[PDB]
């Protein structure tokens, strides 16, 4: 459950894209 | 190559993020985009691309190449589940039909026509 460890290797930032 | 995301943490992350993304952006589809190793094109950051279900594969493809600034000297090709998607197909259709166990889509790109 929410193992949102402070040691994330791969970031994966959210980006809303449209065109 | 392999799935960097799936190696690190996917099931839990994709579950929570899918819920947030569906609640905030119900008309968008959650896609992951990675650079196939060995081609000459620029690399890609680990990001969660959320595109509207209304646009077509043609528009999404054009946006990936425009974002990475693909010059006319090189080419750029996309691949999904080992297939070449139809540019005229809609984002929502391809998403619902290719919807994974985690409700996300995996698309890879190359800057070469022959990957070997």
Topology record:
The complex is a heterodimer of chains A (19) and B (116).
Chain A: E1 13-16
Chain B: H1 4-8, H2 11-24, E1 28-35, E2 47-52, H3 57-67, E3 77-80, H4 91-98, E4 105-110
PDB class: signaling protein
Keywords: gabarapl2, UBA5 LIR motif, protein complex, signaling protein
Assembly: dimeric
Account of the protein in words:
The complex is a heterodimer of chains A (19) and B (116). With 19 residues, chain A is mainly beta. Chain A has one strand at 13-16. Chain A is built from no helices and 1 strand. Chain B has a 4-stranded mixed β-sheet with strand order 2-1-4-3. Chain B is α+β, with helices and mostly antiparallel strands and 116 residues long. Chains A and B meet through strand 1 of A and helix 1, helix 2, strand 2 and helix 3 of B. The PDB classes it as signaling protein. Keywords: gabarapl2, UBA5 LIR motif, protein complex, signaling protein.
Short note summarizing the structure:
With 19 residues, chain A is mainly β.
What labels describe this entry?
heterodimer, A: 19 residues, mainly beta, 21% strand, elongated, B: 116 residues, alpha+beta, Ubiquitin-like (UB roll), four-stranded mixed sheet, 4 helices, acetylation (chain B)
Strand content of chain B: 15-25%
Strand tally of chain B, please? 4
The tally of strands of chain A reads 1
Structural class of chain B: alpha+beta
Number of helices of chain B: 4
CATH topology of chain B: Ubiquitin-like (UB roll)
Helix tally of chain A? 0
The appropriate CATH architecture of chain B is Roll
Main sheet specs of chain A: none
Sheet with most strands: strand arrangement of chain B: 2-1-4-3
Element pattern of chain B in H and E: HHEEHEHE
The assembly state of the depicted protein chains is heterodimer
Element pattern of chain A in H and E: E
Structural class of chain A: mainly beta
What integer value in Å does the Rg of chain B equal?
14 Å
- Main β-sheet of chain B, in a few words? 4 strands, mixed
Largest interface: A-B, 15 and 25 residues
Strand fraction of chain A equals 15-25%
PDB class: signaling protein
Keywords: UBA5 LIR motif, protein complex, signaling protein
Assembly: dimeric
Entry title: Structure of the human GABARAPL2 protein in complex with the UBA5 LIR motif
């Amino acid at each position: 459950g929410a193992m949102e460890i402070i040691h994330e290797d791969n970031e994966w930032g959210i980006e809303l894209v449209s065109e | 190559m392999g799935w960097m995301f799936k190696e690190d943490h996917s099931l839990e992350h994709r579950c929570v993020e899918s819920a947030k993304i569906r609640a905030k952006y119900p008309d968008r589809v959650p896609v992951i985009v990675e650079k196939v190793s060995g081609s000459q094109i620029v690399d890609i950051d680990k990001r969660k691309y959320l595109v509207p279900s209304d646009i077509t594969v043609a528009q999404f493809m054009w946006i990936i190449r425009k974002r990475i600034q693909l010059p006319s000297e090189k080419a750029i090709f996309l691949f999904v589940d080992k297939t070449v998607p139809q540019s005229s197909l809609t984002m929502g259709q391809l998403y619902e039909k290719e919807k994974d166990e985690d409700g996300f889509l995996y698309v890879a790109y190359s800057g070469e026509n022959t990957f070997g």
